[PDB]
Amino acid sequence: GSELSERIESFVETLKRGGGPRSSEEMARETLGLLRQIITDHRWSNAGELMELIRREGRRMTAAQPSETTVGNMVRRVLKIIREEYGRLHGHYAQLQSNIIEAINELLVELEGTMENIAAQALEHIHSNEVIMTIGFSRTVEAFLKEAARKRKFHVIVAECAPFCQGHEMAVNLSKAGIETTVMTDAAIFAVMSRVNKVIIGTKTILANGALRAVTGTHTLALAAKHHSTPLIVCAPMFKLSPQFPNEEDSFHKFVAPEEVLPFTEGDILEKVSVHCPVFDYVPPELITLFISNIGGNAPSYIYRLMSELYHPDDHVL
């Protein structure tokens, strides 16, 4: 009642103001915790009432932050879990609720071991004396490289990000493990692409056609990798996979304050100028060669089947 509504409002305001929390795995875990706290302290007679309640709350959760699609596709996965449970129990009040609770429990067990499965399958994608290229900062590709460097010797080129240098902390965290990290700017990508053997990156949201939104500057990196025919690796978990089509809905990129690009101490020229800072960039599926998740490797021409294994087409509008 009161505790649920204040936790929902604090969740909406935390998604509205900034990045709370930092990692996406803790955000997915607190989304599962919010959904289970909602379903253990509510009353429903039919499964469609719970479906409409989760739809109404998920509309507010995507209206809080449209760029953060992790809560949206997590709500959609929970909705398809509700649909599968009602289908398997239709062909149901306490047994159904216990089945949904244990399904959310085993989903949390699956969610806790995504990074360890990606690090375990990292050994069959990295060979010795290799040139690795990574843009931005994410713990998935960092655990990938720091597990592949336990038995192999190779080189990682960590490119920073031009609005805010998020690759510097990743570079000083990888160089503590001794993987010979090379740091450069965003303008040298094609200027290093003649020597890069394989590009291994992460992403923010896997779209439905195999496309992906990610940190900005990686569409250029994927274009240079397609130009130089180097294979592209996406170390992404199974909660960054969303059915939101790119050209279907608006508000694709997340535009932030232009102070990180052009500071306020520039002068009188800040009135007659128009400075934009898109923190996210769109990459088409033809520039992607391989996705790597906890269940293994998949083609970009296979992601639809994962949709057919994780999402319902009636829940795409939410």
Ligand X SMILES: O=C(COc1ccc(Cl)cc1)N[C@H]1CC[C@H](NC(=O)COc2ccc(Cl)cc2)CC1
220 binds a second copy (CB under 8 A): no
User: CA torsion sign, 305 to 290 to 247 to 254?
Assistant: positive
153 binds a second copy (CB under 8 A): no
| Residues in contact with 205: Cβ distance below 8 Å, sequence separation at least 6, in sequence order | 69, 70, 212, 213, 214, 240, 242, 244
Least spacing, CB of residue 174 vs ligand X, in Å: 13
Least spacing, CB of residue 81 vs ligand X, in Å: 46
Q: Rule CB under 8 A: choose which of 76, 77, 146, 198 binds a second copy.
A: 198
Q: Rule CB under 6 A: choose which of 5, 45, 129, 194 binds ligand X.
A: 129
Query: Judged by CB, which is closer to a second copy: 2, or 129?
Result: 129
183 binds ligand X (CB under 6 A): no
Q: Rule CB under 6 A: choose which of 108, 192, 223, 310 binds ligand X.
A: 192
- Applying the rule CB under 6 A, the residues between 22 and 81 that interact with ligand X are none
Least spacing, CB of residue 180 vs ligand X, in Å: 7
Amino acid, res. 152: R
Q: Rule CB under 8 A: choose which of 80, 125, 139, 228 binds a second copy.
A: 228
Of the listed pieces 46-54, 113-121, 226-234, 288-296, which binds a second copy according to CB under 8 A?
226-234
Q: State the residue for tokens 């997915």.
A: 28
Beta bridge partners of 159: 135, 184
Contact 66, 252 (CB under 8 A): no
Least spacing, CB of residue 41 vs a second copy, in Å: 55
* Residue 192 partner contact from a second copy, ligand X, none using kind-dependent CB cut-offs of 5 to 8 Å: ligand X
Q: Rule CB under 6 A: choose which of 88, 195, 227, 305 binds ligand X.
A: 195
Q: Rule CB under 8 A: choose which of 17, 60, 195, 305 binds a second copy.
A: 195
Contact 213, 204 (CB under 8 A): yes
Least spacing, CB of residue 177 vs a second copy, in Å: 22
Site string for ligand X, 142-181 (x = CB under 6 A): -------------x-x------------------------
User: What is the distance, to the nearest Å, from the Cα of residue 1 to the centroid of all Cα atoms in its chain?
Assistant: 31
229 binds a second copy (CB under 8 A): yes
Q: Please give the residue ranges that form the binding site for a second copy (CB under 8 A).
A: 193-195, 197-198, 227-231
Q: Please give the residue ranges that form the binding site for ligand X (CB under 6 A).
A: 129, 131, 155, 157, 182, 192, 195
